[PDB]
Amino acid sequence: KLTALEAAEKAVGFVPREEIQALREVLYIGDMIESHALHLYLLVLPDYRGYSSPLKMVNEYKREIEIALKLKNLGTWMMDILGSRAIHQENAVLGGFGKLPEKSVLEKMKAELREALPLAEYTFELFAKLEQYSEVEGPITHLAVKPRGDAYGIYGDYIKASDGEEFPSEKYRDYIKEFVVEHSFAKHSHYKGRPFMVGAISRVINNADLLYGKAKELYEANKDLLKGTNPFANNLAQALEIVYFIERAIDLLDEALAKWPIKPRDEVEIKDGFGVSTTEAPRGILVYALKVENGRVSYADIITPTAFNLAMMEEHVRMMAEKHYNDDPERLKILAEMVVRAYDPCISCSVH
Amino acid sequence: MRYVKLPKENTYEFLERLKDWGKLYAPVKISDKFYDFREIDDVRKIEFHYNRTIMPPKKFFFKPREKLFEFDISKPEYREVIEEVEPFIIFGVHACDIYGLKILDTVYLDEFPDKYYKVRREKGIIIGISCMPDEYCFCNLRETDFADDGFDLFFHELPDGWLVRVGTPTGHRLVDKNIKLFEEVTDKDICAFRDFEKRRQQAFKYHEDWGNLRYLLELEMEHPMWDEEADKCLACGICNTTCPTCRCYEVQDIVNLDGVTGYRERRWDSCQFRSHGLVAGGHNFRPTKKDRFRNRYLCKNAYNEKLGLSYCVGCGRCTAFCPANISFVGNLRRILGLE
Amino acid sequence: MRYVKLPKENTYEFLERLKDWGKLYAPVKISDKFYDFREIDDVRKIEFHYNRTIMPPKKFFFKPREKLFEFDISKPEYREVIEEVEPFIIFGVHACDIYGLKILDTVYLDEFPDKYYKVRREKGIIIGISCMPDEYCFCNLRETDFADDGFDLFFHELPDGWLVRVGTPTGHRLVDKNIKLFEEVTDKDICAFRDFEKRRQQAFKYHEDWGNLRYLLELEMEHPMWDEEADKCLACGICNTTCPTCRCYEVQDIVNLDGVTGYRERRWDSCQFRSHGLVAGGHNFRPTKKDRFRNRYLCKNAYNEKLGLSYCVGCGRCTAFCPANISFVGNLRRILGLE
Amino acid sequence: MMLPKEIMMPNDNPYALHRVKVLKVYSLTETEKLFLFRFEDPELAEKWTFKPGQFVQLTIPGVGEVPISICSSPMRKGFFELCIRKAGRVTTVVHRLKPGDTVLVRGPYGNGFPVDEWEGMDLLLIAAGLGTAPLRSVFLYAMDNRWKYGNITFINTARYGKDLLFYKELEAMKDLAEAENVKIIQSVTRDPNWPGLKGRPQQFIVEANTNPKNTAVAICGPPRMYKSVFEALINYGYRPENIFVTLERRMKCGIGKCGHCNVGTSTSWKYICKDGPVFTYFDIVSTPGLLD
Amino acid sequence: KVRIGFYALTSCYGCQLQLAMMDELLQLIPNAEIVCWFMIDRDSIEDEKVDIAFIEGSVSTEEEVELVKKIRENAKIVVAVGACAVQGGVQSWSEKPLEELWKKVYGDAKVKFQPKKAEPVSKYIKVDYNIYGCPPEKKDFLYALGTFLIGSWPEDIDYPVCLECRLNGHPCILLEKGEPCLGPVTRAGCNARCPGFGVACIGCRGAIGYDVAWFDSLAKVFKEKGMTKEEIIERMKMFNGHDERVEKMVEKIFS
Ligand SMILES: Cc1cc2nc3c(=O)[nH]c(=O)nc-3n(C[C@H](O)[C@H](O)[C@H](O)COP(=O)(O)OP(=O)(O)OC[C@H]3O[C@@H](n4cnc5c(N)ncnc54)[C@H](O)[C@@H]3O)c2cc1C
Ligand SMILES: NC(=O)c1ccc[n+]([C@@H]2O[C@H](COP(=O)([O-])OP(=O)(O)OC[C@H]3O[C@@H](n4cnc5c(N)ncnc54)[C@H](OP(=O)(O)O)[C@@H]3O)[C@@H](O)[C@H]2O)c1
Ligand code: NFU
Ligand code: SF4
Ligand code: SF4
Ligand code: SF4
Ligand code: SF4
Ligand code: SF4
Ligand code: SF4
Ligand code: SF4
Ligand code: SF4
Ligand code: SF4
Ligand code: SF4
Ligand code: SF4
Ligand code: FES
Ligand SMILES: [Mg+2]
């Protein structure tokens, strides 16, 4: 929703106000918190803890599920307050919001973020205790967005690489190639003829120096685990990003409260144009290219993080399977599934 | 609701058939300009197009002079005088008088039902008729112009007959016994009814809203109008004795010449008389004529909780029958500032 | 009745003092053109000159969505959900809405008094205010323009302040606790009140008598107007969910995810919906949209026996808030032949 | 009836429900069961009396509540009976009730047949389909109070011979009823192979044993048969002031608040739970729309 | 224990996610046995006998039609969850044929899997009950699951969103700004979320069944406020793209 709003506003030549952009960033941070907590605790925790379902983990790992629910509820409540709901937000309109909450609700949101910061710390410790399998060690090309401003963030105009080069967001199809494979409804992506990775670990590797606060302290402490060579560092990078984004959301709420009261929405008149917005999704770079002609969409191009990550997923599953070749089929299946889940795949966004 | 139609040539035959149900009371001409409800022997005497009667229809239930008890002073015993009330039909009741009968029913059948009133009220069949207002009628201001219930048959005037509303099982039986004389209502009769309603609404003298009349009367009890209109007043009480919704009666015990027997008598009373608010020792709670004159306005403009309308229905009998040419509606509109 | 004057500079102080009695609900502006009764934190938000609210004042006693019971399915037990209602003040109620509250009281404080309604009706203090007619207001036709009772304090607009009517002991206590802010009514204030009443009567769009509306509606149930206006209808039920005197509700039992606990819920309903008349087996007693559309007119134009008024008070919410631009008063006047 | 503190609870809540237990379940037809109930409160059970023709609100916990007429006589104190047809959600849950289960009931509601002012006159009861149960209540009240009412006739009709309500009871009762000034007529309409009687009730009104001028008529069934039955009764000389019928509309409360059981027009607007369900002949005649 | 299976067709998994994020789902585990739900369970078997089957997503693959036929074979109650399963979702917004969309998106390339145009689940099997929304509300899931656990079934909704909009006192966007709000014809249960946030309804929960969805009156209301026929039709067919009533009812009022 927010990447589409950014693309449409770029196409129609509209610039949102600073407080509206801050509130949109808070909503996006809520989405990242919910998605990362949900992934970490309900999709990659049970297979590390020896279960087959998080619903079977209610009596043994009670505190872990409790903190999982608290983080997920914080993200869901942020999205319920700012967007209309946790899924398919409707309050995010062209040029702002249909209705903004009262000031006391924002104060309560800031207080709840402050309360949830220790939960993020515990999550980072719990996922630092886990294991990065050495069967998948190899050089990775990490692509991530260059943040706008002077802080680790989600909105950006440039796309960085682990090879050092950087290109403008609108020129993405000059450097990224989409091709269709005969075994999937998704389009695999290549960078200079080679597969690449986008995600939380790529974000950390590319924009580590932009972190500030407890996130920077934790990153400096645990830089040894966050090497851009193992795909299994993505979960720990997600925990680190939760830690960062709680504080970032607190600061953005302070910035928004500095300019109260806020008019919910600006009048936008739809001129023709072509806008490409590369915001950083919880799972990697999201590219939205929309062309507007007479108040209508004439050209749409969506490239999603999982479509970016599928080729690297195939390569790393190949190396994992060759390392665990001719073993018991169940063990190979579960380890390959763990490798795939390390990439937090959203198959729905792959096909869009 | 049943909407049977009575043709113009069967009206007198239906009125003759009404005499099979009891005694028929219909408005007849008692003088050149005055009407009254009198017992019918010749059906041609009934005046269907009349303005008002010299006496309200309450005289058939709240009798003008009634003997309540007969007594023996030795071994004190009061024996009630109740006669077997045979069924009777009151024909030609206007809608305002029907609402007045409803108001008097609320007064006389509320908690202690009046036996004398009830035995005659239960035996009366109220057949209402439509009317064209004259200069004295303001039943549209008091909202007593169209009757909802309280009748058995209601006759609505048509160019080629009548439209009959049946609202009671008694009216159903009356229609079904003489169904030969009745016909079916067509769209033409409905259009004629609509035209008559429009003409009736156009024929009223005053078209005003009187919501705040009670509060303005309360606020303006020290008006010079009260003095100037009471100086005209004759204290004759016609405005109360010819008012459909006046409940007041005076009681008296009359001893026969033997000194042992006698009777207790009930007659209509007026608040315009001296002894209406007179207590022992000489204290009158309405001592001056102005006080009684204003008290009538206050009482008639009061709000009836059970029905939702004022005790004044708007018949204009107090204005038409006032020998001193005092206008009730004119004084009320002067209080409201509409003059 | 007790008359007090509130000067223009003490109005906000009196409204601040009203918060000592409880929570204050007054009409505020929720959008550019719409009002509603909302809880007051800043007294300057109160709109004294408003036309109507997006929700009727019945939402404080007949709540829009209410939880009646909580139950355990094992050991069948229904426990009523009633909280201790603290006293509150509903300020700014127009006279039409006061009459609507009286009508809903007759509906919900009948032989089986509704506990949920009665508990909140006991603790509510209704302070009424005067208003100027809009193009949609026809409370003069329904006779709900001037309120007699049903309030505690009534505020009447004056050029140099307010005129306060005290009708109940609660209003007497409210006036006597803050008697420092009130004054004495002179003849000039009475004259100003009379002028405001004349202007208010002159500001109404329609001046007609609607006595025969029920009977004409009964006689004209096969009119082409019903089909014409029903084809415009959206069946959105706003005319019922915004009507002050609509009694209808729909009940539902919701079972919690444990399968043992749950609750019973009550929400406002509209006769414009399909399931209002569904009687199982597939039979609907109002099976067409025309049937429900006509049923609303029949129900709203019916006669309330206990009060003597129609169930429609004349606020115009069904005409103002109809998204299909369907005129209730216009269609009623089409039935009467006044167009 | 006007039972105090048990029809509205000491909490003054008219929606408050009483705990009752189902003792006997009996399948009359395929989509029909007869339920015998008693209140789990012994004092309430011994104090609960109703009128023939009144209904109750049967609350199955967690599903909803439905209005059911009482089919047993009010003089069979302690117990009351309900006859319920499976029409949908709530009745589907009701039909699974085995003996010994607890369900919630409030009532009685509405006005019943004026059996007190029917003293010393004949009784004609015309039941069609599911309308037998309220007329079963009236019939059993008359049988318990036989000295009060004169000749009684019971006409029961149904679409098929297997759908006749209380066929076994009325067939077993016919003996000693014919000798006890009671006539039972049972007929079918859509079954031309039925060994028993065939035809509509208006055909069997002439076969009644009731004096037409001194007979109270109680008719229950679909609203469509009412006009034909009225024509037949009026032709044979039954007085229109003594004809009573029952109507059904959608009910959610039974106390007059939900506004779903509305009949009539703007001239006479009435509610079934408060003004019925028993209506007189002149009420049906005056306002159209009460039938169909 | 009631055996419940949640199956995924072509979907965004919003309905499964909404059910998974409910805190009351922890109460469902002791009362119901979850057979097939791959999002949370890994030991889930596709071909198993389930008492109640919840189906999410549209039928956009031939393998999906085989799966829904299998589910209808294996389930006593089949429940369609969400706008994708009930009315085809937003994927059925376009009336353009499959080959045109395929050429526009994937070019001239082969995938070896067979797609099809989005259709509701009710076209290939018989759905006994429906759960409306996109995603469905938590209250809808609670009511449906609770009534199924008691042995009853949920009541279908035939009242518009305007009911909940007027219960909550939301300002009417259609009366003030003239916005194209689809609320008067859309099923309630969402508590008027979009009109409460100042947005217009886009009819995610779907149009009212039982032939009491009046697109002609709403089209006339839209036409008085200056909208062309095709704009109204596209707006109404955003989520009701498999509705045959919309085209006929709008073309009636524009003829
Ligand atoms: C005065 C009266 C007496 C009745 N007596 C009997 C009787 O003796 N035996 C019998 O089998 N049935 C009787 N009924 C009908 C009975 O109420 C319905 O069969 C039942 O309410 C429908 O149940 P359902 O599961 O089909 O509900 P659904 O069809 O799923 O509908 C749900 C709701 O609809 C309402 N409803 C549906 N049909 C009716 C109806 N006909 N009357 C009132 N509300 C209705 C109820 O409130 C019910 O909770 C009577 C109805 C009335 C009004
Ligand atoms: N429970 C009560 O005490 C009570 C009281 C009042 C109302 N009700 C309601 O009344 C209904 C009972 O009837 P039902 O639904 O079971 O009926 P039904 O059997 O489905 O059909 C009506 C029956 O009456 C016959 N019939 C006789 N004369 C008729 C006539 N003139 N017009 C039409 N049919 C005529 C029909 O013959 P055909 O098949 O040829 O038409 C058929 O046998 C239920 O809805 C019930 O709830 C019940
Ligand atoms: N994170 C993330 Fe998505 Ni469901 C992918 N791929 C789109 O933003
Ligand atoms: S009728 Fe006229 S003169 Fe006689 S008492 Fe009444 S007001 Fe006075
Ligand atoms: S006080 Fe006077 S006006 Fe009132 S009822 Fe008595 S006589 Fe009539
Ligand atoms: S006060 Fe006058 S107009 Fe009013 S009812 Fe009495 S006599 Fe008639
Ligand atoms: S007051 Fe009205 S009803 Fe009475 S006679 Fe005059 S016009 Fe007729
Ligand atoms: S508000 Fe208007 S469109 Fe909506 S249901 Fe009422 S009459 Fe119909
Ligand atoms: S029937 Fe219709 S108009 Fe009458 S109270 Fe119920 S919802 Fe309102
Ligand atoms: S019908 Fe219309 S005018 Fe009358 S009370 Fe209801 S909303 Fe107000
Ligand atoms: S209907 Fe009458 S009382 Fe109500 S707001 Fe309009 S003018 Fe005021
Ligand atoms: S109905 Fe909506 S939430 Fe559910 S799968 Fe389809 S698009 Fe997602
Ligand atoms: S805003 Fe939309 S949903 Fe709400 S009342 Fe208006 S039309 Fe209905
Ligand atoms: S208002 Fe309309 S679009 Fe918004 S949640 Fe409700 S049904 Fe869906
Ligand atoms: S059942 Fe609710 S009004 Fe009669
Ligand atoms: Mg793409």
XYZ file of N, CA, C and O in Angstrom, chain A residues 177-230:
216
model
N 17.386 -8.203 -14.383
C 16.721 -8.902 -15.473
C 15.698 -9.877 -14.911
O 16.014 -10.664 -14.013
N 14.479 -9.825 -15.438
C 13.417 -10.747 -15.058
C 13.219 -11.767 -16.171
O 12.962 -11.395 -17.320
N 13.332 -13.047 -15.830
C 13.119 -14.121 -16.788
C 12.218 -15.182 -16.174
O 12.177 -15.358 -14.953
N 11.489 -15.882 -17.036
C 10.482 -16.850 -16.622
C 11.058 -18.250 -16.757
O 11.533 -18.637 -17.832
N 11.020 -19.007 -15.670
C 11.462 -20.394 -15.661
C 10.251 -21.293 -15.862
O 9.120 -20.942 -15.508
N 10.489 -22.467 -16.440
C 9.425 -23.393 -16.805
C 8.958 -24.264 -15.645
O 8.314 -25.290 -15.887
N 9.264 -23.895 -14.400
C 8.849 -24.683 -13.248
C 8.200 -23.841 -12.157
O 7.950 -24.358 -11.063
N 7.921 -22.566 -12.414
C 7.321 -21.722 -11.392
C 6.565 -20.581 -12.055
O 6.935 -20.117 -13.135
N 5.509 -20.130 -11.382
C 4.722 -18.983 -11.813
C 5.379 -17.655 -11.471
O 4.760 -16.604 -11.671
N 6.601 -17.674 -10.951
C 7.319 -16.472 -10.566
C 8.456 -16.197 -11.541
O 8.924 -17.086 -12.258
N 8.897 -14.945 -11.557
C 9.987 -14.507 -12.419
C 11.269 -14.419 -11.601
O 11.358 -13.619 -10.665
N 12.253 -15.240 -11.954
C 13.547 -15.182 -11.292
C 14.325 -13.955 -11.753
O 14.194 -13.496 -12.890
N 15.148 -13.424 -10.855
C 15.908 -12.211 -11.114
C 17.400 -12.506 -11.081
O 17.867 -13.356 -10.316
N 18.147 -11.789 -11.918
C 19.596 -11.916 -11.999
C 20.235 -10.539 -11.928
O 19.687 -9.562 -12.447
N 21.397 -10.467 -11.283
C 22.183 -9.241 -11.186
C 23.557 -9.512 -11.780
O 24.345 -10.270 -11.202
N 23.837 -8.888 -12.925
C 25.074 -9.108 -13.676
C 25.272 -10.587 -13.995
O 26.388 -11.108 -13.959
N 24.176 -11.272 -14.311
C 24.220 -12.675 -14.656
C 24.280 -13.632 -13.488
O 24.380 -14.845 -13.713
N 24.220 -13.143 -12.255
C 24.325 -14.002 -11.088
C 23.160 -13.765 -10.140
O 22.632 -12.653 -10.061
N 22.734 -14.798 -9.417
C 21.704 -14.609 -8.392
C 22.200 -13.729 -7.255
O 23.394 -13.659 -6.964
N 21.254 -13.050 -6.610
C 21.561 -12.146 -5.513
C 20.517 -12.318 -4.420
O 19.518 -13.020 -4.587
N 20.761 -11.670 -3.286
C 19.892 -11.781 -2.124
C 19.460 -10.402 -1.649
O 20.268 -9.471 -1.588
N 18.178 -10.281 -1.323
C 17.631 -9.110 -0.654
C 16.942 -9.583 0.617
O 16.438 -10.708 0.690
N 16.945 -8.734 1.630
C 16.316 -9.075 2.887
C 16.950 -8.312 4.032
O 17.649 -7.325 3.825
N 16.679 -8.801 5.245
C 17.174 -8.140 6.447
C 18.691 -8.212 6.543
O 19.339 -7.241 6.951
N 19.277 -9.355 6.184
C 20.727 -9.494 6.260
C 21.405 -8.610 5.218
O 22.454 -8.009 5.483
N 20.808 -8.495 4.028
C 21.332 -7.574 3.026
C 21.218 -6.132 3.499
O 22.132 -5.327 3.284
N 20.100 -5.790 4.145
C 19.941 -4.456 4.715
C 21.038 -4.160 5.727
O 21.650 -3.087 5.700
N 21.295 -5.106 6.632
C 22.328 -4.909 7.645
C 23.690 -4.734 6.988
O 24.412 -3.773 7.271
N 24.032 -5.625 6.053
C 25.354 -5.584 5.432
C 25.555 -4.276 4.674
O 26.625 -3.659 4.749
N 24.530 -3.816 3.953
C 24.692 -2.619 3.136
C 24.651 -1.335 3.960
O 25.424 -0.409 3.692
N 23.772 -1.243 4.957
C 23.533 0.008 5.666
C 23.759 -0.140 7.167
O 23.036 0.439 7.979
N 24.767 -0.928 7.553
C 25.067 -1.116 8.967
C 25.491 0.181 9.643
O 25.096 0.448 10.784
N 26.302 0.995 8.967
C 26.824 2.207 9.587
C 25.746 3.242 9.880
O 26.007 4.178 10.644
N 24.553 3.099 9.306
C 23.462 4.034 9.542
C 22.637 3.700 10.777
O 21.759 4.488 11.143
N 22.887 2.563 11.422
C 22.169 2.214 12.639
C 22.522 3.177 13.766
O 23.596 3.783 13.781
N 21.600 3.324 14.715
C 21.872 4.135 15.892
C 21.156 3.544 17.096
O 20.032 3.049 16.980
N 21.819 3.600 18.247
C 21.218 3.178 19.496
C 21.524 1.752 19.902
O 22.618 1.228 19.645
N 20.548 1.118 20.556
C 20.715 -0.262 20.994
C 20.928 -1.195 19.812
O 21.625 -2.207 19.940
N 20.358 -0.861 18.653
C 20.617 -1.648 17.454
C 22.087 -1.602 17.073
O 22.678 -2.632 16.731
N 22.702 -0.419 17.137
C 24.118 -0.315 16.801
C 24.980 -1.012 17.845
O 25.984 -1.643 17.500
N 24.598 -0.924 19.120
C 25.338 -1.639 20.159
C 25.288 -3.147 19.931
O 26.316 -3.836 19.989
N 24.095 -3.672 19.636
C 23.941 -5.104 19.406
C 24.663 -5.543 18.138
O 25.263 -6.623 18.105
N 24.617 -4.723 17.085
C 25.325 -5.056 15.856
C 26.833 -5.067 16.064
O 27.524 -5.965 15.574
N 27.366 -4.077 16.783
C 28.798 -4.066 17.054
C 29.202 -5.266 17.898
O 30.276 -5.843 17.693
N 28.355 -5.657 18.851
C 28.661 -6.828 19.668
C 28.652 -8.110 18.838
O 29.566 -8.936 18.950
N 27.637 -8.291 17.990
C 27.392 -9.564 17.317
C 27.697 -9.515 15.820
O 27.106 -10.265 15.039
N 28.606 -8.627 15.405
C 29.017 -8.556 14.004
C 29.581 -9.876 13.487
O 29.528 -10.139 12.281
N 30.119 -10.719 14.373
C 30.689 -11.989 13.931
C 29.629 -12.895 13.314
O 29.893 -13.585 12.323
N 28.423 -12.909 13.886
C 27.359 -13.741 13.334
C 26.778 -13.150 12.056
O 26.322 -13.896 11.183
N 26.786 -11.828 11.924
C 26.159 -11.162 10.783
C 27.126 -11.003 9.613
O 27.316 -9.913 9.079
N 27.744 -12.106 9.204
C 28.561 -12.111 8.002
C 27.683 -12.350 6.784
O 26.834 -13.245 6.778
N 27.894 -11.548 5.745
C 27.083 -11.654 4.548
C 27.444 -12.831 3.666
O 27.640 -12.669 2.458
N 27.538 -14.024 4.255
C 27.905 -15.217 3.502
C 26.935 -16.362 3.767
O 26.764 -17.245 2.922
N 26.296 -16.355 4.934
C 25.385 -17.418 5.327
C 23.949 -16.930 5.254
O 23.615 -15.913 5.877
